Each structure stands twice: as C-alpha cells, then as structure tokens.
C-alpha cells in the first residue's frame, strides 16, 4: 500500500512561514518527482512548485520570491517552506505526484494553512420570519456576522432539524472578517409552537453559540 | 510560464447526455501524453480519471475517454451518471531539458440540468441586538431556484444602492438540482434609520420579483 500523510499546517501570522512536511509510505521519496499545489477557498488548483527524481527545484514566478522544496530522504520527506505570507496564502496544501506522464500517481489529503490577523469569535443574530407572507411556508435563519478565521459550521436543532437547511458559503467583508447566513424554511403554522435554534461552531476561537430564532 | 485553458467554465446537461470538455495548452507540453484529466467533487480531493492524454486508470468507467492532439484536449463521458457532476481540471507537464513545470486550468463545473424554477424569494430587517453594535444588515433569500443566473439590485426609498450589498451561492442541491442565493445589504444603524422603505428585487428572465418592508412596521 502506497500513502503520501502531509504534515504541518495551522494558523500562521502574516509575514510569517509555513513549513509543511510530506511523509511517504511504501516507497522512496527520492525515487519519484513532487510537487506542491494548493487551493484557495472556492478557487481552483494552482501549482507552486516541483521537485524532480534529481533534487532540483522549479518553482513558480510567484513562488520564487519565498518557497523553498526541500528533501529528506533519512524521512522520506518532501518538504515546503513558505515566507512572507499574504491574505492570499490561506489555502489547503497538497502534495502529489501529480501523473500526467506516468501512471503512478498519489496525492495527499491536504493540510489547511490559515493567515490570521486576529482570532474573532462570531456574533449571532437572527433572521426572524405569525406574519409569514409565503402561505404555509415561513423562512428563518442565522445571520453569522465578524469573525475569523474560518470555518464555522452551523447546524438546526442540534441536527435534528436537517430538511431545507441552506448554509451559505461564507463571504470576506471589506472589514476583513468574514460573515454568513444559514436558513432553513418550516411550515409557517409551526412558528408559535415549535422551537427553532441554530447551533454556530467556531472552533479557531473555542466558542459555540446556540440562538432561539422567534417571530417578530 | 504555461498554463491551461479548459471549455467551457462551466456547463448543463443530463443524466444519459453526452457531454464533451476541450482543454488547450500554452505550449506543446514537454513528453507528447503529458495531460491528465481530474475530477474533483466538493470538500474532497482531486481524483485523477485519465493519463496519458488517453489512458484511463483501473477503476475508472469506460465512459470517460481523453482524445487529446497536440494542444487540443479532449475529455468525453459518452453517458454522463449522477457521480460525473463535478469540476473537471487539466493538467499538463512541460519543461526543457533543464526545466520541469506544470500549470493546471481554470476548472469546468459539468451541472445537473434541471427546468426552470422561480425562487422563494423573503427579506429579513436587521435584528435590534444588531443595530446596537452601530451596522445594520438587511438579508434579501433566494430559495430553490434555477438556473444559477439572478439579478438582485436593493432599493433603499426606491433609491438603487451600488456596492454594499455581497451575495453568496449555494452549489446545487442534492435533491432538486436548485440553488439558494442570499444578498446582504450593509449599513450603519444610522444611514439604516434615515430610511423607510428597504426593498430586495429579483429579476430573472421576463420576471422581477419584489420583496419589501417598512422600517418599524411589524
């Protein structure tokens, strides 16, 4: 069994570095050319680097300036190293033998990298539907506003409330600090009887906040 | 240096329909059979289908097929399936002798195609703890539609605001193949209060439709 484990990854200061490790398993590190790619949140693949079977390192013209492919065979290690960190850098780091002359071909799981400022928990606020102006159908939600970094999940009725939830991805406000929404619709009868609360997790910053969502 | 360019960005099609994804390259990538063909669903890693412009993985459905020449690629899925809706990357090799590079290309999102639905379409005021911190958001909700492409312009006394408003999508629901859209309105508790009528118009097609609230009355 082959098995590529990436190590490292974490928040990180800007300016700061990553150093991220790539552990091998079954095989030789050095027998093998690597590379280093990376994807940004809801953006697509883009390669950083690789190192071929001779120990020479191509990097990209934005990677250049701070990246550094290194190789341990006593490890069997490949590694990264990334100074000078930017907002931009926040990604989930892959390392692979990426295949495309070859037929062995083996990723890693990918290790996520945050660039944090701050660490701000979320503050929770509710989006009340009674008055319901859509028949038998009401819409309620969560307005998850000013934290960072990501990710927060959120769930309806400590997840027993799953049918028609709808959480958005989140978005970066110009404040630098993320914010989403997450709804659900219920049938508009229930307003006054049944209980609805959303359960925001936000773990970068340890805290977890439950809101009762009422009418009016 | 390189890079990659797939066709289209992103697609509709059926489930037995034949769809077809061309990729073309930069250069001339470095050993002639130097593209792979990836499939990547959301939250989970790239898998690669096809290497070697042609060759597919074991494993992997006879349906796909790579046709690449040159620097036109070319991947075929003969009876698309419910697991073949995902983004599709390419990815080339090309070097020198003394260089070694990869790029990949933009993506290709192959989605379900689904009959037009009108959103469910609901506004929510600012909640009060809100306002007491000085910012107000008004939510406008865009629930279980298709297809993907919305206007939704906010109109403060039906005045049409411009950039301070940020919407987010859904990816296609399991189900239904509908998407959820919301628009958020941002402004101060102040510039908030100057105003009454706090309206969120949805326009698709031949059809615009208009939610709206004063603010106090409820």
């Known amino acids: 069994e082959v098995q590529l484990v990436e190590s490292g990854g974490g928040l990180v200061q800007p300016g700061g570095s990553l150093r991220l490790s790539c552990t091998a398993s079954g095989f030789s590190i050095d027998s093998y050319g690597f590379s280093w790619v990376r994807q940004a949140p809801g953006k697509g693949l883009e390669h950083i680097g690789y190192?071929?079977?001779?120990?020479?390192?191509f990097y990209a013209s934005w990677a250049k300036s701070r990246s550094t492919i290194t190789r341990n065979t006593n490890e069997n290690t490949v590694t990264l190293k990334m100074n000078s960190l930017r907002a931009e850098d926040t990604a989930v780091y892959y390392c692979?033998?990426?295949?495309?002359?070859?037929?062995?071909?083996?990723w890693g799981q990918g290790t996520l990298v945050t660039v944090f400022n701050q660490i701000k928990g979320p503050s929770v606020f509710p989006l009340a539907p009674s008055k319901s102006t859509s028949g038998g159908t009401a819409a309620l939600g969560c307005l998850v506003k000013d934290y960072f970094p990501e990710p927060v999940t959120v769930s309806w009725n400590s997840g027993a409330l799953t049918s028609g939830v709808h959480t958005f991805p989140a978005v970066l406000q110009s404040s630098g600090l993320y914010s989403l929404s997450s709804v659900v619709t219920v049938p508009s009868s229930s307003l006054g009887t049944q209980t609805y609360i959303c359960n925001v997790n936000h773990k970068p910053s340890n805290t977890k906040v439950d809101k009762k969502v009422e009418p009016k | 240096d390189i890079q990659m360019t797939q066709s289209p960005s992103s697609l509709s099609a059926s489930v037995g329909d034949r769809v077809t994804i061309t990729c073309r390259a930069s250069?001339?990538?470095?050993?002639?059979?130097?593209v792979a063909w990836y499939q990547q669903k959301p939250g989970k890693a790239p898998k690669r289908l096809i290497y070697?412009?042609?060759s597919l993985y074991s494993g992997v459905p006879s349906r796909f097929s790579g046709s690449g020449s040159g620097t036109d690629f070319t991947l075929t899925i003969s009876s698309l399936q419910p697991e073949d809706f995902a983004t599709y990357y390419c990815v080339g090799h090309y070097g020198s002798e003394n260089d070694a590079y990869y790029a990949f290309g933009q993506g290709t999102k192959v989605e379900i195609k689904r009959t037009v639905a009108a959103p469910s379409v609901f506004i929510f005021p600012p909640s009060d703890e809100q306002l007491k911190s000085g910012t107000a958001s008004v939510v406008c909700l865009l629930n279980n539609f298709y297809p993907r492409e919305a206007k939704v312009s906010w109109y403060v006394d039906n005045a049409l605001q411009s950039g301070n408003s940020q919407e987010s999508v859904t990816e296609q629901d399991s189900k239904d193949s509908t998407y959820s859209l919301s628009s958020t309105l941002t402004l101060s508790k102040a510039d908030y209060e100057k105003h009454k009528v706090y309206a969120c118009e949805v326009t698709q097609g031949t059809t615009s439709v208009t939610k709206s609230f004063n603010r106090g009355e409820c």
């Open positions: 190192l071929t079977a001779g120990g020479r390192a």
């Open positions: 692979a033998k990426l295949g495309t002359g070859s037929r062995f071909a083996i």
């Open positions: 070697a412009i042609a």
């Open positions: 250069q001339s990538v470095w050993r002639n059979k130097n």
